[PDB]
Amino acid sequence: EVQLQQSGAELVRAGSSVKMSCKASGYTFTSYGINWVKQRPGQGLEWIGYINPGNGYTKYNEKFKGKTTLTVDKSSSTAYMQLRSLTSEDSAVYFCARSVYYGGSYYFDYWGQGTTLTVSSAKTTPPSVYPLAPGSAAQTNSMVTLGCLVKGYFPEPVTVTWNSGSLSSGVHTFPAVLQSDLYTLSSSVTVPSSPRPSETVTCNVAHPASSTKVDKKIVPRD
């Protein structure tokens, strides 16, 4: 079995640098080539370069070229990639892959899990949690939807659960969005109108980075 196993520094100020490791196992490291592909949060796969550990050297994708250095270390059977001038548009997941030949030309047969990189200047900041209830008294008469707002945190991720997890149906946890260098997300839940407020509805949000564990019960009114 073949395996590209990677990782490296993952959260850095802008203008900084990073070195990503791509460790190959299961074959002889000098018989094939590695490629690094970029994928910003907004889909699309971007080809960067190609290092050939053996007939030694490289070839870069105009655009990453100049800001990207591809090297490798034969002895440790590890290839490396380094991003200089890190900026925000660089915050993304990077994969490495082995190119095989077969008739015609090359193709990527094995992929690393990809190391995530997040170019920020933010500081670990706990999330503020606020309850989201109907509001203007007027239900939605039949079933009722309540929420939980989690604002101003960093970094990711965040754990949101309702009634310790007893509530699992009708729950929507939205991907976090970057307000101002901080993240914000919310989670809705839906229960018959016979439960709330009568029965208790509580969101259990957690933010490991800041050792923040919190339980905001959803009571009526404002």
Binding site: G44, Y102, Y107, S188
Partner: protein, 214 residues
Amino acid sequence: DIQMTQTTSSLSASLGDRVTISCRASQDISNYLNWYQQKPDGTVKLLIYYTSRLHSGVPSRFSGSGSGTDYSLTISNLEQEDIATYFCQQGNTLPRTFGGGTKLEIKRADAAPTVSIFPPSSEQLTSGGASVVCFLNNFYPKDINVKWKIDGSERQNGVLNSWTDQDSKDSTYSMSSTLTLTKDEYERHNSYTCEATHKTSTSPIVKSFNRNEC
């Protein structure tokens, strides 16, 4: 540079069907087309390489054909786990280029969003902050636009939106939008509205609230 284009970003097909994804290349790629899949995991495995027809280590239910400029993948028996994103790529010239990918979704019948407005909470108001949140749950398809109105108009500035991937059990979509204002501006107006425009009605769905009806 060689442009790899894949018509249909979002392909809709029901479990069982024989899906076919298409890929076109800005020039004769000489049968050096490869297909990569990507689960919601983010992981990407190799499926078919060398102008289709060539299996790597995947189920036989995956296959490709084509030539010249046009290529297509195929899924004879669409599996639940096959709901992923598919990227074609060319190996004919440097640099290497991938298509824009095609993500799949399921059969669902038209649904129409259940919209919900939520004024800020006491708690956030005391910390001197105000965020108006609105919910658009379980709709179909995923196309949807939201507009905020303060006392009857505008407000683009300060709106933050997020959408969920298709739903595991029901194949719907959900969206959250947040208008975030200062506590001082917030209180300057009484009515807030969340208007949702969906291909389920010509009349935009509307939900609002009057700061003094709580």
